[PDB]
Amino acid sequence: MEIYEGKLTAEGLRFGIVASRFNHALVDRLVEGAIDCIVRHGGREEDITLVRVPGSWEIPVAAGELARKEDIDAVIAIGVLIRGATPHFDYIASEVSKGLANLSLELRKPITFGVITADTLEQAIERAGTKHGNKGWEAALSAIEMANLFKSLR
Amino acid sequence: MEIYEGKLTAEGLRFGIVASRFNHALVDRLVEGAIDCIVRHGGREEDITLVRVPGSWEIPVAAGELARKEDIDAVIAIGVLIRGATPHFDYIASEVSKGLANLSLELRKPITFGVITADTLEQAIERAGTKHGNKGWEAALSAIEMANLFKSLR
Amino acid sequence: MEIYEGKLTAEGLRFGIVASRFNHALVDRLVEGAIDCIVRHGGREEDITLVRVPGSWEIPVAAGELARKEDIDAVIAIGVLIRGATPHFDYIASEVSKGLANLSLELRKPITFGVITADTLEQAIERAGTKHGNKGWEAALSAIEMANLFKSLR
Amino acid sequence: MEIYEGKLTAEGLRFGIVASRFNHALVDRLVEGAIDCIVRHGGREEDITLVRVPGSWEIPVAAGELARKEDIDAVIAIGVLIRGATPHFDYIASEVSKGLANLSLELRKPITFGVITADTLEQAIERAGTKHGNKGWEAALSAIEMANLFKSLR
Amino acid sequence: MEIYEGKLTAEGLRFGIVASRFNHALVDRLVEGAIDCIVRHGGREEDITLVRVPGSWEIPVAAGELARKEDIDAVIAIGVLIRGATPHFDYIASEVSKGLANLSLELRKPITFGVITADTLEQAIERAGTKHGNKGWEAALSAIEMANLFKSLR
Amino acid sequence: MEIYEGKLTAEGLRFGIVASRFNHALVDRLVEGAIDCIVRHGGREEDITLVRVPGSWEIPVAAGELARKEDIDAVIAIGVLIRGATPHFDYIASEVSKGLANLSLELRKPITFGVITADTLEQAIERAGTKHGNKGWEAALSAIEMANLFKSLR
Amino acid sequence: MEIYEGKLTAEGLRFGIVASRFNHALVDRLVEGAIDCIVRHGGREEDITLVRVPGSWEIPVAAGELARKEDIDAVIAIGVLIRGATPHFDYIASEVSKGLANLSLELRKPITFGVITADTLEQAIERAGTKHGNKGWEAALSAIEMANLFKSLR
């Protein structure tokens, strides 16, 4: 039986991070977590490209630009969505997730989904550094592992 | 009338399995079930490729890499999703299923959906070895049958 | 004004039927209804290709194989989905319907949706031969009418 | 500032109408409304192509055939969906709308959505000639306006 | 074992339709459905005799006149009865059905019962073109099938 | 398509009216309505035969005597039944209606059912000249139309 | 049978619009809708006369002045009435409607009633551009159609 799996060492890997600006206070914590993960797993900060976009709606189109660069091994998508009074939340989150997934399949490159979709502000605060750990860190781990995996798998 | 149907014999077939690492305790049981099915239906374990991915979100992109290998007859996707407090579960499960289906149609190769989507942990425990039988076994049977079917159908 | 419409005569038409094996007791009734419709509207049973697939998840990929055969005029998709305890039903039904629709648009060939999506077993029993008439018969009628329509429309 | 907008004059425009046969009593009223709109806005009835399809499921595939004809300026899709006891309504309406939208984007031609999606029969009766005006008329107006718009825009 | 059954082809068959005038709005839809069925199953409209009667009470006596013509193969009875405030509905529906059945047995000719007996107007609207399909179409199918059956059976 | 229908002109037609004597106050209004209809649609009063019978039970046997006269074109049956305390109402109304229908089928002559079957006196008052129009007038119209119809149909 | 009906083309027609000033915010939207309708149906804006009046009470007397001009084909009356605390609303709306109708009959010229009579402000907002479409547009369509109709009818 052949086993393919990725180590959690980030030596030599190049990363791209797309972070929305809306929900500024929490997206900053998520980005801090992602950079901390990449650096403390052996990666250099000089090998990280950070792209700032106004809202979550533009994360897919910015990730399309980063992910087609040859010198990028994986892309981390970071954003915070909190449900409001209107159904706007549903139609934004669905399109963001769908675009990211379609892009990842199209470009044959791991694009990791580190976007928080919370019903309440309190949940988003939990998932961005407090009791539940930040999805920035979780997404960075996923991206590192897939970047290592695809080196063997390709 | 022409009838096309697949036998349940796994002699000579090559399989690929993509298993997420999240929900480690149950995904291991699902993978055990899938391998047991393939082996006990006549297949060899040396003809199975196992790919481990961090979460369910990356199953489609890893299955895209396995399914384009010529020496793979079918791909079994294995993962466990349990609904949490946030609507994150919906946007993950929808994208995983949609990506797998689109990939299967695109590559003209059977990609079987052995992912558990449970509201509660108790349901997931039921569907992964206990009272309801493991979807790893069910997915392996589906993959074997489609692999045999496409030999006749093509 | 130009009117394009299809007659309900099945002389000379070739059909493909994809039927899942899950919910064996009801899918058999649906297939019986479809074949009865095709035969009693003038079609021959020697001009029908039947493909059996394990579950509803594989209906799109099998229909992709039948529908690209030149000697097939329309494809009838037959399956039964009954909602269970998990949200698995939603993610299966959505992908089956989406795959069938995308395939039909891509191949410019009518693929008729004769899949039962029931909340309860009692509804599925109603819609498969009992009080509400079988969707196998309804789907066969739709396929016959579109097959006749596209002869004029093309 | 450049303003692009379409007049509501139908002189010289060619139209295609796809109408399902299910819910016969109301689809006939919708088609009457659409033809009345086209004729009373200056269009000729000899410049209208009407295609009849069995159910709403086949509207996208028939619209694909009409919309690729060069001598068709816009396509009007007409159908009536009333929610039943099963979730079948959701999976039919979603696929019809998605197919129509994808087709319109693909063919760069306006395909107007004049399909009634009603929870109850009483609502469908309202929206097909009675208190709320028929979506056949509304869809015909939309198609006329886009047909005029694309002449300037292209 | 000898099997006698009728095909659903209407080539060469002659039909008679008796339609009441009461409930004008729905009987017209039922008659449209019946004629559409006969025409789209291969029959000609020149081979259909339509008899209009004031109320449902006179359908049996008019069907007695049509059914004794030699050049009529089957008779379709079309009418709409909606229960009112008085028990008049019972004594009308019972006599209509009894007369039609006795006439059919006496003349050894299929007389198909396409009369709607509804408790409420909403049910009658359902059964005459809307959600439940029109009994005009159902009765026309029954008449076609029996007309084909009696050719073999006699 | 051959259309048979009767005009509403009563020139030259001969009518027979059987009216019960029970419920004298309302049967008189019904008879007035019937005669008014026949006269104002062009018929002469000298061409009307009126037969008075004690109760509704004897209407069928008197109509048997009128309807076998050659110089009678149609027979109008007029009576009023109001439900009492005993089930007598059911067994009278059923037999009256059944006898009239059987007689009409036997003699191949239109016998129109203008009998009021009311649960309460207030309903019978409504249906005999007041808010709901008298069944004498309605029955006379039905008889005129069938008399004209059978001239063409025979 | 002679059919008289008006097309929806506004070429060459001259219009007069009387708009009250009370409920300034909504009357402006209604006037915008009316002018947009006239322009986009082929009419010129140079052929429109706009008269502003203080309240709805003066719309009839101003419409009397416009409608007697020879070079005016139809008059559109635009105003918004919202019920207050006093019965003043009833006595204003009744007189406005009565005056407009009497004027239209007297001058043999179409005067279209595009006045909103709302119980609540929320309804008036609905009917002036939002969910229910603006009565300015509806009234302009009515005026165009009657202006075309009277050309044939006179």
Residue numbers in the entry:
A (entry chain 4), B (entry chain I), C (entry chain F), D (entry chain Q), E (entry chain h), F (entry chain M), ...: 1 to 154
The authors write:
The second mRNA vaccine candidate (LS-P2-VP8*) encodes a multimerization domain derived from Aquifex aeolicus lumazine synthase (LS)35 fused to P2-VP8*. LS from this hyperthermophilic bacterium naturally self-assembles into 60-mer icosahedral nanoparticles. LS-based approaches have successfully been employed in other vaccine studies to display antigens on the nanoparticle surface, thereby significantly improving the immunogenicity of the presented antigens. The success of these studies is likely due to the fact that multimerization of antigens on a nanoparticle surface favors the generation of potent, long-lived immunoprotection in germinal centers through clustering of B cell receptors for multiple and simultaneous binding to the antigen epitopes.
In order to characterize LS-P2-VP8* P nanoparticles translated from mRNA in cell culture, supernatants of cells transfected with LS-P2-VP8* P were purified by density gradient ultracentrifugation and analyzed by transmission electron microscopy (TEM). mRNA encoding lumazine synthase alone (LS only) was employed as control. The pooled gradient fractions were analyzed using negative stain EM, which showed a uniform distribution of spherical particles with hollow interiors. A cryo-EM structure of LS-P2-VP8* P nanoparticles was determined at 2.6 Å resolution (at 0.143 F.S.C cutoff). In the 2D class averages generated from the LS-P2-VP8* P nanoparticle dataset, image classes were observed that show diffuse, nonuniform density protruding from nanoparticle surface, which may correspond to the P2-VP8* portion. However, ordered density corresponding to P2-VP8* was not visible in the cryo-EM map. Only a short segment of unoccupied density in the cryo-EM map at the end of the C-terminus of LS was observed where the P2-VP8* moiety is expected to be present. Since LS and P2-VP8* are fused via a flexible protein linker, it seems likely that the P2-VP8* protein portion cannot be clearly visualized on the surface of the LS nanoparticle structure due to this flexibility. The 60-mer LS-P2-VP8* nanoparticle core is ~15 nm in diameter with ~2 nm distance between adjacent VP8* protein as measured between the positions of C-terminal LS residue from the cryo-EM structure. Our data indicate that the protein translated from an mRNA encoding an LS nanoparticle domain fused to P2-VP8* P is secreted in vitro and self-assembles into 60-mer nanoparticles.
